[PDB]
Amino acid sequence: GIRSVADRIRVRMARLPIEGEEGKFYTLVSYVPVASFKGLVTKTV
Amino acid sequence: TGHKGFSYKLKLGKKIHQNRGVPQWFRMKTGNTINYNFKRRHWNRRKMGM
Amino acid sequence: TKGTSCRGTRHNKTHILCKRCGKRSWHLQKQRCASCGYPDAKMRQYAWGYKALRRRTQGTGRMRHLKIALKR
Amino acid sequence: VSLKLQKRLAASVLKCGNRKVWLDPNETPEISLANSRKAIRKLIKDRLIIKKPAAMHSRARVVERKQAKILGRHTGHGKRKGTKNARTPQKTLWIIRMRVLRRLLLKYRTTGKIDKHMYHDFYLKVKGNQYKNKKALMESIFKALEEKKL
RNA sequence: GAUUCACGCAGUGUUAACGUGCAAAUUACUUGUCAUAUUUGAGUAUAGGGGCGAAAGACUCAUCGAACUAUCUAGUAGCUGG
RNA sequence: UGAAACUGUCCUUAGUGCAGAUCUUGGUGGUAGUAGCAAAUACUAAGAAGAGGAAAAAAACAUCUUAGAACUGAAGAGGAGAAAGGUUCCUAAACAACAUUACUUGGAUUAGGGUGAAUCGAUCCUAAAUUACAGAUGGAAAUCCUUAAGAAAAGGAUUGAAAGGGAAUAAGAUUAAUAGUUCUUAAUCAAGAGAAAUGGUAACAUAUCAUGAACUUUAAAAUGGAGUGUGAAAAUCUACGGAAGAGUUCUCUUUUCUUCUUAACAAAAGUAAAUUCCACUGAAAUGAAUCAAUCAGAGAAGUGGAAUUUAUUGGCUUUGUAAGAAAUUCAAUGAAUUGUGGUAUUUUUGCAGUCUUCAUAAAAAUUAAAGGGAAUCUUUUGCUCGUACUAAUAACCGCAACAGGUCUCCAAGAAGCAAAAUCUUUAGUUAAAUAGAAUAACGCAGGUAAGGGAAGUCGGCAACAUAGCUCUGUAAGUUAGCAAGAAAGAGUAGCUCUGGUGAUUAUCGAAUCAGAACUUUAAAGGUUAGGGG
RNA sequence: GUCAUCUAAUUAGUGACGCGCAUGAAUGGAUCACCGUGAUUCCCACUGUCCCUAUCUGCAAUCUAGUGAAACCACAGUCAA
RNA sequence: CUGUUGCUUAUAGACGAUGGCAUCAGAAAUCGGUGUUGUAAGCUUUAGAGUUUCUUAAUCAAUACUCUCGGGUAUUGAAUG
């Protein structure tokens, strides 16, 4: 709902080239579901 | 109303017919000042009172 | 509630279009026209209403036949 | 583009509301050309327009509370909010009892257990609220018959 | 022409909000009332020293201790302003 | 600068000199880029169209589709009408102006399109009331009279209701928009055309039948309200058997959800409830019956009959219409299914008696019957007018897209005494006088608080507190009806059980009441919900 | 007004007294049971009314982009005598 | 030199201002310390008032036992790395 959000969220954002113009990039934030957030650090996939 | 007399309906239609602007060709006449119809009205602006 | 609130029920016409003078002055319950005095044979005119005389009288209309006669 | 005309026409053809109409998001150009009911009917046949299913409303919880109420699991004193006469009308209890007791008296008289004189006496006793239930009436009738035969 | 709740309705209190307002009288809670002396639509009748009034000089088109509109009328002013 | 009339002197004449009149009319400043653009819970992501999300976060981005999240909560922010509005209806192009930012949106601009009736209404009748010729009155305008005054009208003239009365139509489909109005199928109505009957004891009955004038009478149209009982239909709920589709599924769930329908008009396999009459018989030891009543020798109860009512024929199931329609699936136009019940709740529509009035709760058009006895199936046509749309937190009235006002119809689930509060399904909408950041004072709206408890104050103003149901208990006073829910006290949850209240003749069914072990965070209190003396 | 009573304290309330400025009998006198969004006083309970203020939330106010009025205004705007 | 700007910056704050760091900067996880609440979800877990079906084994059952001083939260204006 609108009144509550998860306490912690793990996301993966990937920088990809824009299809139209090759000079510029754009970010795509996606959702990575995990069972528990213990022992998870910032990983460059 | 949905229900109206015959004569009243015709006077409703005429008020519809008279709510038109100046045709473009009439506006091109020599020495013409009639560009806009100042007798115009719209349903939500002025009630024709009939 | 004598102002804004009381004007909610004004949806019943008192006057409708007259037949002799063409104005919305035909009183429905009184069965008379307040302007041209219909049923009455004589057109309703008053000397205190000098403007109402010049608004509707001879020469304020088409004069379909009189214009030929007077010029004749 | 604006598919407002197609959403309205589809609902009229599908006999649903505008909330149930599904217009394909990947075929906006094809739907936009459909400006008539004949074209919409063709699109429905091709499954470009789909009538969404109604939202599910399950009565499973209500049923399982009814069974618990049948066994008396929720009919306590802290769960009653209406008066005694509101929950069980006293007049209709009397209407049922008078129908039950007068049915029995009529059956006994026509069978032959009691005559018209003893049926008449027991009729006014029933109306006078003498017997609580059916069992109490059959007991008194049996007692009266034994006294008569003695 | 008993007691109460509800759809509705009114306007007891906050003398709350607002008070160049949502509104030329409204909003929120509280209170009262909520079918027979009840509530309500349409038609109809009653008009100016007249009407209508379970009576407040109340209501009679935001106008009433005498409506609105036009004529007498550029009413008169020993009073005020220029 | 301006581009066509003007000036000096003398007499004459006057609408002849402005800083004020809260002066009149027109224009314009400071205030001032200030006060504001804060009721109606709320928006987010991807994509499309567009000049119109750019960028050192310029943190916000109108319309449309999909997904998420939501609100109105079925006495609605739903689907339709009367009044009022009058083209606001539908579509396309286009956004200068208007909707307190913007708008590709619009009830806004431009151009087209759109309202189909023998059966719905107006038209017909009359109610309160209204208005004529003649007559009466008046100086006059005009007023009175509405059948009384008349050489007028068998009897009394005109108007007066889109909620009163009233000949006759439905289902499916169709349009960008109209549909008891169009199309298919199936009906109905009115006006026309081609010495005079039987049956039953009786109540009464017979696909037209089976003559029935003047005149008269009766009935219908046509009659308050309350409350209780009940017949039938629909909605919801539920029992048995399924057919098709959908949801959940690593934890279970023979599971949870949807569809399984049917018109006007007629038919008569089967079968109801209530009331009133008819025949036989004659009631006392008085009986018959209702929830209540109420009834009987001017004749009860019983048995056998007749009639009427029950949303068209004849009430319900059933049948024709009619499955060929429509709904749910499947295949790529063609294929499948469309049982039977309930001593349950609500709504609707009838019926039967009861209560109440110093209240008795319309008329006519129009129709039928009677008393009387004067006279001797097919087919044609059905004209005039309204019909679009809103009916309101944006189409009506308030200067407006104004939190004000405005008469109605249809009405799901939970829970509950309850159409209450709260949540949800069908339908509608996410926009409705702009947003983003920061999270000072003073505010408006909603709150809590140690110890004390009205010491505050004109005054317990405001707020707090009591609050449902069951059981016990209840004073003074009194018009003897009340006070009284007086006051006051106790109980209440969850789970597992036990017992009482019936129908059909062992099977079936209803929510209601009482009681007992055990457990815990010890139970009306989420919401609704008396402070008392 | 005087006497009681209510309170620690009573221009208040209630019960009495009555030569009553100027009460009094259908201008109705006396009397109150039920009733009252009527006027007044006292008890119980409860509490931010108060001792005596603390603190929480929403909408504003603050700043910004767009948009954007009005009342008022002789000229104006530091004091003492 | 100074100001803007960045840390959606703090010992500051309505806005300005003020204070600190600015590549040995900063930010974020995870992680240990420190707090709050009260013992997570599962099961072939042992107590369970009773009940049902088999024929005496299932099954249903408020609560309750072991795993479990568990699980969850913890700078957002907390302290380390």
GROMACS .gro file of C-alpha atoms (C1' of nucleotides) in nm, chain F residues 256-533:
model
  278
  655U      C1'    1  -1.229  -2.128  -0.372
  656C      C1'    2  -1.491  -1.835  -0.776
  657U      C1'    3  -1.824  -1.761  -1.253
  658U      C1'    4  -2.251  -1.957  -1.610
  659C      C1'    5  -2.647  -2.310  -1.601
  660U      C1'    6  -3.187  -1.787  -1.840
  661U      C1'    7  -3.651  -1.668  -2.089
  662A      C1'    8  -4.102  -1.194  -2.283
  663A      C1'    9  -4.586  -1.001  -2.455
  664C      C1'   10  -5.002  -1.296  -2.590
  665A      C1'   11  -5.258  -1.764  -2.526
  666A      C1'   12  -5.320  -2.333  -2.365
  667A      C1'   13  -5.508  -2.648  -1.980
  668A      C1'   14  -5.126  -3.257  -1.814
  669G      C1'   15  -5.095  -3.188  -1.270
  670U      C1'   16  -5.201  -2.916  -0.832
  671A      C1'   17  -5.270  -2.480  -0.408
  672A      C1'   18  -5.425  -2.072  -0.014
  673A      C1'   19  -5.822  -1.760   0.154
  674U      C1'   20  -6.331  -1.596   0.142
  675U      C1'   21  -6.853  -1.618   0.008
  676C      C1'   22  -7.273  -1.901  -0.130
  677C      C1'   23  -7.575  -2.413  -0.249
  678A      C1'   24  -7.792  -2.931  -0.126
  679C      C1'   25  -7.875  -3.327   0.276
  680U      C1'   26  -7.918  -3.308   0.818
  681G      C1'   27  -8.081  -3.056   1.254
  682A      C1'   28  -7.652  -2.880   1.757
  683A      C1'   29  -7.747  -2.852   2.474
  684A      C1'   30  -7.368  -3.295   2.800
  685U      C1'   31  -7.342  -2.671   2.361
  686G      C1'   32  -7.023  -2.690   1.997
  687A      C1'   33  -6.678  -2.478   1.564
  688A      C1'   34  -6.246  -2.214   1.525
  689U      C1'   35  -5.816  -1.768   1.519
  690C      C1'   36  -5.166  -1.516   1.652
  691A      C1'   37  -5.620  -1.210   1.796
  692A      C1'   38  -6.093  -1.282   1.701
  693U      C1'   39  -6.551  -1.436   1.566
  694C      C1'   40  -7.001  -1.748   1.468
  695A      C1'   41  -7.470  -2.062   1.509
  696G      C1'   42  -8.262  -2.292   1.518
  697A      C1'   43  -8.324  -1.579   1.031
  698G      C1'   44  -7.933  -2.245   1.126
  699A      C1'   45  -7.344  -2.418   1.364
  700A      C1'   46  -7.008  -2.869   1.298
  701G      C1'   47  -6.991  -3.287   0.907
  702U      C1'   48  -7.024  -3.469   0.386
  703G      C1'   49  -7.062  -3.326  -0.129
  704G      C1'   50  -7.064  -2.913  -0.453
  705A      C1'   51  -7.057  -2.367  -0.705
  706A      C1'   52  -6.822  -1.902  -0.749
  707U      C1'   53  -6.442  -1.502  -0.708
  708U      C1'   54  -5.946  -1.324  -0.585
  709U      C1'   55  -5.398  -1.458  -0.602
  710A      C1'   56  -4.885  -0.869  -1.096
  711U      C1'   57  -5.194  -1.203  -1.886
  712U      C1'   58  -5.547  -1.602  -2.047
  713G      C1'   59  -5.694  -1.957  -1.496
  714G      C1'   60  -5.271  -1.865  -0.891
  715C      C1'   61  -4.821  -2.212  -0.912
  716U      C1'   62  -4.513  -2.612  -1.170
  717U      C1'   63  -4.587  -2.719  -1.704
  718U      C1'   64  -4.692  -2.606  -2.237
  719G      C1'   65  -4.711  -2.309  -2.727
  720U      C1'   66  -4.392  -1.850  -2.845
  721A      C1'   67  -3.891  -2.139  -2.777
  722A      C1'   68  -3.415  -2.237  -2.867
  723G      C1'   69  -3.371  -2.133  -3.415
  724A      C1'   70  -3.280  -1.647  -2.909
  725A      C1'   71  -2.941  -1.542  -2.505
  726A      C1'   72  -2.541  -1.705  -2.150
  727U      C1'   73  -2.068  -2.025  -2.043
  728U      C1'   74  -1.691  -2.285  -2.299
  729C      C1'   75  -1.423  -2.526  -2.756
  730A      C1'   76  -1.231  -2.543  -3.265
  731A      C1'   77  -1.115  -2.283  -3.712
  732U      C1'   78  -1.843  -2.047  -3.953
  733G      C1'   79  -1.916  -2.495  -3.688
  734A      C1'   80  -1.974  -2.783  -3.203
  735A      C1'   81  -2.141  -2.915  -2.657
  736U      C1'   82  -2.466  -2.858  -2.179
  737U      C1'   83  -2.897  -2.541  -1.980
  738G      C1'   84  -3.202  -3.140  -1.305
  739U      C1'   85  -3.473  -3.141  -0.861
  740G      C1'   86  -3.580  -2.915  -0.366
  741G      C1'   87  -3.591  -2.573   0.146
  742U      C1'   88  -4.126  -2.613   0.845
  743A      C1'   89  -3.468  -1.990   0.630
  744U      C1'   90  -3.425  -1.378   0.559
  745U      C1'   91  -3.572  -0.940   0.290
  746U      C1'   92  -3.856  -0.693  -0.084
  747U      C1'   93  -4.293  -0.673  -0.394
  748U      C1'   94  -4.798  -0.781  -0.484
  749G      C1'   95  -5.274  -0.972  -0.311
  750C      C1'   96  -5.622  -1.177   0.062
  751A      C1'   97  -5.874  -1.227   0.545
  752G      C1'   98  -6.068  -1.054   0.950
  753U      C1'   99  -5.934  -0.663   1.398
  754C      C1'  100  -5.866  -0.142   1.573
  755U      C1'  101  -5.965   0.423   1.501
  756U      C1'  102  -6.231   0.898   1.391
  757C      C1'  103  -6.727   1.536   1.686
  758A      C1'  104  -6.179   1.294   1.042
  759U      C1'  105  -6.593   0.857   0.705
  760A      C1'  106  -6.141   0.961   0.358
  761A      C1'  107  -6.339   1.305  -0.536
  762A      C1'  108  -6.618   1.371  -1.018
  763A      C1'  109  -6.683   1.282  -1.520
  764A      C1'  110  -6.568   1.072  -1.990
  765U      C1'  111  -6.662   0.560  -2.078
  766U      C1'  112  -6.858   0.032  -2.007
  767A      C1'  113  -7.184  -0.368  -1.877
  768A      C1'  114  -7.610  -0.580  -1.685
  769A      C1'  115  -8.109  -0.580  -1.570
  770G      C1'  116  -8.680  -0.458  -1.582
  771G      C1'  117  -8.995  -0.363  -2.054
  772G      C1'  118  -9.160  -0.576  -2.499
  773A      C1'  119  -9.111  -0.191  -2.979
  774A      C1'  120  -8.978  -0.412  -3.478
  775U      C1'  121  -8.969  -0.857  -3.791
  776C      C1'  122  -6.304  -1.655  -4.041
  777U      C1'  123  -6.065  -1.319  -4.454
  778U      C1'  124  -5.939  -0.810  -4.544
  779U      C1'  125  -5.873  -0.230  -4.541
  780U      C1'  126  -5.729   0.183  -4.257
  781G      C1'  127  -5.516   0.402  -3.781
  782C      C1'  128  -5.396   1.127  -3.914
  783U      C1'  129  -5.133   1.599  -3.578
  784C      C1'  130  -4.744   1.702  -3.191
  785G      C1'  131  -4.301   1.543  -2.805
  786U      C1'  132  -3.898   1.190  -2.837
  787A      C1'  133  -3.126   1.385  -2.884
  788C      C1'  134  -2.862   1.507  -2.382
  789U      C1'  135  -2.777   1.665  -1.818
  790A      C1'  136  -3.115   1.591  -1.422
  791A      C1'  137  -2.647   1.789  -1.081
  792U      C1'  138  -1.947   1.817  -0.570
  793A      C1'  139  -1.963   2.081  -1.393
  794A      C1'  140  -2.561   2.093  -1.836
  795C      C1'  141  -3.139   2.347  -1.343
  796C      C1'  142  -3.179   2.829  -0.952
  797G      C1'  143  -2.800   3.132  -0.659
  798C      C1'  144  -2.326   3.698  -1.145
  799A      C1'  145  -1.934   3.092  -1.186
  800A      C1'  146  -1.715   2.420  -1.302
  801C      C1'  147  -2.031   2.838  -0.608
  802A      C1'  148  -1.907   2.282   0.030
  803G      C1'  149  -2.610   2.643  -0.059
  804G      C1'  150  -3.096   2.473  -0.279
  805U      C1'  151  -3.422   2.112  -0.603
  806C      C1'  152  -3.970   1.600  -0.657
  807U      C1'  153  -3.907   1.068  -0.782
  808C      C1'  154  -3.799   0.470  -0.960
  809C      C1'  155  -3.469   0.017  -0.928
  810A      C1'  156  -3.112  -0.143  -0.462
  811A      C1'  157  -2.561  -0.728  -0.337
  812G      C1'  158  -2.226  -0.957   0.071
  813A      C1'  159  -2.017  -0.925   0.607
  814A      C1'  160  -2.191  -0.790   1.113
  815G      C1'  161  -2.587  -0.641   1.387
  816C      C1'  162  -3.229  -0.560   1.687
  817A      C1'  163  -3.138  -0.215   1.301
  818A      C1'  164  -3.193   0.078   0.542
  819A      C1'  165  -2.708   0.258   1.195
  820A      C1'  166  -2.128   0.311   1.210
  821U      C1'  167  -1.702   0.021   0.947
  822C      C1'  168  -1.522  -0.301   0.505
  823U      C1'  169  -1.626  -0.516   0.026
  824U      C1'  170  -1.874  -0.722  -0.497
  825U      C1'  171  -2.165  -0.512  -1.001
  826A      C1'  172  -2.122  -0.003  -1.189
  827G      C1'  173  -1.844   0.485  -1.146
  828U      C1'  174  -1.395   0.737  -1.060
  829U      C1'  175  -0.845   0.848  -0.916
  830A      C1'  176  -0.988   1.436  -1.138
  831A      C1'  177  -1.264   1.731  -0.931
  832A      C1'  178  -1.027   2.658  -0.731
  833U      C1'  179  -0.150   2.419  -0.897
  834A      C1'  180   0.268   2.180  -0.722
  835G      C1'  181   0.811   2.084  -0.499
  836A      C1'  182   1.161   2.149  -0.081
  837A      C1'  183   1.244   2.256   0.428
  838U      C1'  184   0.978   2.050   0.900
  839A      C1'  185   1.075   2.798   1.274
  840A      C1'  186   0.709   3.106   1.565
  841C      C1'  187   0.159   3.202   1.593
  842G      C1'  188  -0.251   2.921   1.405
  843C      C1'  189  -0.722   2.565   1.216
  844A      C1'  190  -0.857   2.015   1.282
  845G      C1'  191  -0.763   1.559   1.567
  846G      C1'  192  -0.482   1.378   2.043
  847U      C1'  193  -0.222   1.232   2.513
  848A      C1'  194  -0.019   1.351   2.990
  849A      C1'  195   0.285   1.266   3.626
  850G      C1'  196   0.046   1.433   4.151
  851G      C1'  197  -0.405   1.718   4.279
  852G      C1'  198  -0.925   1.719   4.100
  853A      C1'  199  -1.348   2.304   3.943
  854A      C1'  200  -0.886   2.567   4.353
  855G      C1'  201  -1.007   2.827   3.668
  856U      C1'  202  -1.453   3.097   3.533
  857C      C1'  203  -2.019   3.537   3.514
  858G      C1'  204  -2.121   3.034   3.491
  859G      C1'  205  -1.819   2.257   3.468
  860C      C1'  206  -1.820   2.697   2.851
  861A      C1'  207  -1.489   2.313   2.621
  862A      C1'  208  -1.334   1.845   2.713
  863C      C1'  209  -1.335   1.404   3.024
  864A      C1'  210  -1.655   1.041   3.206
  865U      C1'  211  -2.154   0.662   3.152
  866A      C1'  212  -2.298   0.380   2.715
  867G      C1'  213  -2.490  -0.292   2.413
  868C      C1'  214  -2.741  -0.734   2.610
  869U      C1'  215  -2.886  -1.091   3.044
  870C      C1'  216  -3.001  -1.152   3.574
  871U      C1'  217  -3.098  -0.942   4.061
  872G      C1'  218  -3.277  -0.482   4.265
  873U      C1'  219  -3.532  -0.021   4.253
  874A      C1'  220  -3.713   0.535   4.681
  875A      C1'  221  -3.975   0.995   4.798
  876G      C1'  222  -4.364   1.187   4.537
  877U      C1'  223  -4.829   1.096   4.235
  878U      C1'  224  -5.377   1.313   3.855
  879A      C1'  225  -5.271   0.597   4.083
  880G      C1'  226  -5.174   0.613   3.457
  881C      C1'  227  -4.630   0.714   3.621
  882A      C1'  228  -4.162   0.825   3.842
  883A      C1'  229  -3.826   0.394   3.609
  884G      C1'  230  -3.356   0.237   3.160
  885A      C1'  231  -3.475   0.533   3.890
  886A      C1'  232  -3.072   0.461   4.186
  887A      C1'  233  -2.734   0.015   4.272
  888G      C1'  234  -2.465  -0.471   4.196
  889A      C1'  235  -2.308  -0.911   3.912
  890G      C1'  236  -2.226  -1.172   3.435
  891U      C1'  237  -2.024  -1.148   2.906
  892A      C1'  238  -1.396  -1.412   2.539
  893G      C1'  239  -1.191  -1.873   2.284
  894C      C1'  240  -1.234  -2.401   2.252
  895U      C1'  241  -1.462  -2.903   2.345
  896C      C1'  242  -1.928  -3.074   2.473
  897U      C1'  243  -2.455  -3.150   2.698
  898G      C1'  244  -2.978  -3.052   2.714
  899G      C1'  245  -3.495  -2.797   2.585
  900U      C1'  246  -3.825  -2.600   2.201
  901G      C1'  247  -4.085  -2.965   1.571
  902A      C1'  248  -4.248  -3.201   1.080
  903U      C1'  249  -4.343  -3.644   0.805
  904U      C1'  250  -4.453  -4.134   0.966
  905A      C1'  251  -3.669  -4.442   1.137
  906U      C1'  252  -3.573  -3.990   0.790
  907C      C1'  253  -3.571  -3.437   0.764
  908G      C1'  254  -3.520  -2.912   0.953
  909A      C1'  255  -3.503  -2.384   1.234
  910A      C1'  256  -3.225  -2.040   1.466
  911U      C1'  257  -3.300  -1.947   1.976
  912C      C1'  258  -3.238  -2.049   2.513
  913A      C1'  259  -3.004  -2.284   2.932
  914G      C1'  260  -2.581  -2.552   3.148
  915A      C1'  261  -2.059  -2.790   3.224
  916A      C1'  262  -1.508  -2.884   3.198
  917C      C1'  263  -1.050  -2.659   2.989
  918U      C1'  264  -0.734  -2.222   2.814
  919U      C1'  265  -0.562  -1.737   2.803
  920U      C1'  266  -0.310  -1.117   2.741
  921A      C1'  267  -0.998  -1.242   3.232
  922A      C1'  268  -1.347  -1.091   2.736
  923A      C1'  269  -1.984  -0.513   2.495
  924G      C1'  270  -1.649  -0.142   2.363
  925G      C1'  271  -1.257  -0.180   1.658
  926U      C1'  272  -1.735   0.075   1.518
  927U      C1'  273  -2.216   0.207   1.711
  928A      C1'  274  -2.335   0.316   2.210
  929G      C1'  275  -2.784   0.699   2.854
  930G      C1'  276  -2.360   1.061   3.301
  931G      C1'  277  -2.656   1.018   3.772
  932G      C1'  278  -2.889   1.230   4.212
   0.00000   0.00000   0.00000
